[PDB]
Amino acid sequence: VAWYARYPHILEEATRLPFAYPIGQYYDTGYSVASATEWSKYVDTSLTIPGVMCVNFTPTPGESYNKNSPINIAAQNVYTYVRHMNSGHANYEQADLMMYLLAMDSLYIFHSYVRKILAISKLYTPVNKYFPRALLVALGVDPEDVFANQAQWEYFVNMVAYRAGAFAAPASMTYYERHAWMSNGLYVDQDVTRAQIYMFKPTMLWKYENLGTTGTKLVPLMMPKAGDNRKLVDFQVLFNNLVSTMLGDEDFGIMSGDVFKAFGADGLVKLLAVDSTTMTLPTYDPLILAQIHSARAVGAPILETSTLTGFPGRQWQITQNPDVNNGAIIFHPSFGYDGQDHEELSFRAMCSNMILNLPGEAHSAEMIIEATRLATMFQVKAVPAGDTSKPVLYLPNGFGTEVVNDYTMISVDKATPHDLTIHTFFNNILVPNAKENYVANLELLNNIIQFDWAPQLYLTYGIAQESFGPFAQLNDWTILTGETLARMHEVCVTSMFDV
């Protein structure tokens, strides 16, 4: 239009608009019709933008139920490598060496978690009100405690690194590097200033728990959830509990000495020290974005204290018995547990084949492999012992090194005083008949759409008795089968457990 070219001054004076609204603060759009107040709650003048979502992952060996599993193959390989350069101590097995290594991984994950907690609290920007209190709430700490005891937190994480330097683990194996990189980073969905932050929080750890002559057993160790005012004393208690049965074990000292002899001190994994001038910075990572987008929730871990009607002895433990399954490492968990002893009908929508969504047109093999690391489809229902089966558990076909349990989203409340909100959910949400459930689900959906590569959702309704497929924007997709997913997971786990 030549009129715009002829009157740019009037165009500029007519197009003066304030952009770049700082996120993390509640905004009211106002009323276009000033007399619409008679319809009080029939008009939505509120506008809240979420700014962070936490992916509650879990480190796993990858579906071992016999001696042909990648975990057992890596156990045999690492034991052969250690013992063929070892002249001396012969009192442990490949399985024992691998439980060590897994405990090393768990405490490395803990160190990365606490280091991220420390480095986040120094982040303050005018364009984002979520920084850093929302992130600290999502990770499950007390921002006031961190602000008051920054020095204590720094020295505690440094001491954690120093004490983790006592034992030795291989650095060629990429398990530790992948887990630390995943759990020690902030990821934006877009390369924009007011972007949304993606976080990974370990839902659980692997307290080593040696007792009895019937091998070892990695018992679950729970982790703080979002909205928990956990302090440095609680985190120190957690670390001491983790390393309580880890030091003072002469067999563990023997394993550490043998791996130190095998892999030289230069070839070990070392936790880097941190100081006051270390700044964590959100980064754009398309690979992590894609693998977050193609992630499927598996539910809460099952503990000994968790009651389950008809499913006894189904805890998430890594059992190692020399006289059971020929001494192979066994880890066969049952998914579909949410936390309460009821059906959780929403998990029924996970029984369909997953859809792998990818950006762009041409996809490389490595990118496709990295894009399905968190994907996990159920295969069969676990057989309930007894006539009562109030919960329903699904046995997976095979999973990768990490499994996603929940997703935590933090957003501004619509009501006064517009504080942060805690939203934990799986890939499937069940909405029963209620006055506010539908609008709450609508707010949930709109908040999730703000994130670019959000995980695909599977909504279900209690009144229609009908679920829904992926609630996502499909760009370049394919239908994945359980066998293909199992092959990809086997490849990825074997590659991760390599020396």
In the chain the first and final C-alpha atoms are separated, in Å, by 66
Judged by CB under 8 A, the residue of 137, 204, 350, 404 near a second copy is 350
In whole angstroms, how close is the CB of 434 to a second copy at the nearest point?
A: 9
Whole-number Å distance between alpha carbons of 117 and 140: 9
The answer to whether 247 contacts a second copy (rule: CB under 8 A) is yes
**Residue closer to a second copy (CB basis): 307 or 487:** 487
For the CB of residue 130, give the shortest distance to a second copy in the complex, in Å.
15
Q: Does 198 bind a second copy (CB under 8 A)?
A: no
Comparing CB distances to a second copy, the nearer of 210 and 484 is 484
Bridge partners of 381, per DSSP, are 394
Stretch that binds a second copy, among 103-111, 163-171, 281-289, 486-494 (CB under 8 A): 486-494
3-state secondary structure of 81: helix
Distances 24 to 130, 187, 419, 486 between C-alpha atoms, Å: 5, 17, 9, 41
Told to check if 174 binds a second copy by CB under 8 A, we report yes
- Token pair in block for residue 65: 């139920």
Task: Decide whether 229 or 326 has the Cβ nearer to a second copy.
Answer: 326
Specify the stretch interacting with a second copy by CB under 8 A; choose among 52-60, 109-117, 282-290, 474-482: 474-482
Distance CA(202)–CA(195), nearest Å, equals: 23
Ramachandran assignment for 50, one of left (phi > 0), alpha (psi -120 to 50 degrees), beta (any other): beta
Q: How many residues bind a second copy (CB under 8 A)?
A: 119
Block residue for tokens 């005012």: 229
Binding test (CB under 8 A) with a second copy, winner from 56, 60, 72, 401: 72
For residue 494, the minimal CB distance to a second copy (Å) is: 7
Contact between 412 and a second copy (CB under 8 A)? Answer: no
In the bound state with a second copy, the residue whose beta carbon lies nearer, of 96 and 145, is 96
Residue number with CB closer to a second copy (316 or 458): 458
**Residue 264, interface with a second copy (CB under 8 A)?**
no
Instruction: Tell me: does residue 442 bind a second copy (CB under 8 A).
Output: yes
Q: Please give the angle made by the CA atoms of 227, 29 and 451, to the nearest 5 degrees.
A: 45
Longest dimension (CA), the chain: 90
Pick the piece of the chain touching a second copy (CB under 8 A) from 6-14, 147-155, 231-239, 284-292: 6-14
In whole angstroms, give the CA distance from residue 232 to residue 122.
16
CA distance 167 to 259: 9
Tell which one of 222, 303, 355, 422 touches a second copy (CB under 8 A).
355
User: CA 85, CA 222: separation in Å to the nearest integer?
Assistant: 37
Nearer to a second copy, 234 or 498 (CB): 498
Q: What CA–CA distance (Å, rounded) separates 69 from 74?
A: 9
In the structure encoding, which two tokens stand for residue 213, read together? 């002559």
* CA 34 to chain CA centroid, nearest Å: 46
Q: Which of 148, 159, 324, 351 binds a second copy (CB under 8 A)?
A: 351
Sequence letter at residue 201:
K
Site for a second copy in 267-296 (CB under 8 A): 275
Nearer to a second copy, 345 or 422 (CB): 345
Site string for a second copy, 381-410 (x = CB under 8 A): x------------x--x-------------
**Contact between residue 394 and residue 379 where contact means Cβ atoms under 8 Å apart:** yes
Q: How far is the CB of 275 from a second copy (least distance, A)?
A: 6
Gap between the Cα atoms of 94 and 240, Å rounded:
27
Query: Which residue from 461, 291, 312, 486 is spatially nearest to 391, judged by alpha carbons?
Result: 312
- Comparing CB distances to a second copy, the nearer of 203 and 456 is 456
Instruction: Choose one: 12-20, 57-65, 116-124, 218-226; the region binding a second copy (CB under 8 A).
Output: 12-20
> Taking CB under 8 A as the rule, does residue 325 contact a second copy?
no
Two tokens at 124?
């303050």
Residues 356-385 that bind a second copy (CB under 8 A): 356, 358, 361, 363, 365-366, 368-369, 377-381
Contact status: 126 vs a second copy (CB under 8 A): no
The β-bridge partners of 411 are: 421
Q: How long, in residues, is the chain?
A: 499
> Does 35 contact a second copy by CB under 8 A?
yes
The one-letter amino acid code at 156 reads F
Judged by beta carbon, residue 36 or residue 237, the one nearer a second copy is: 36
Among 214, 278, 307, 473, binds a second copy (CB under 8 A): 473
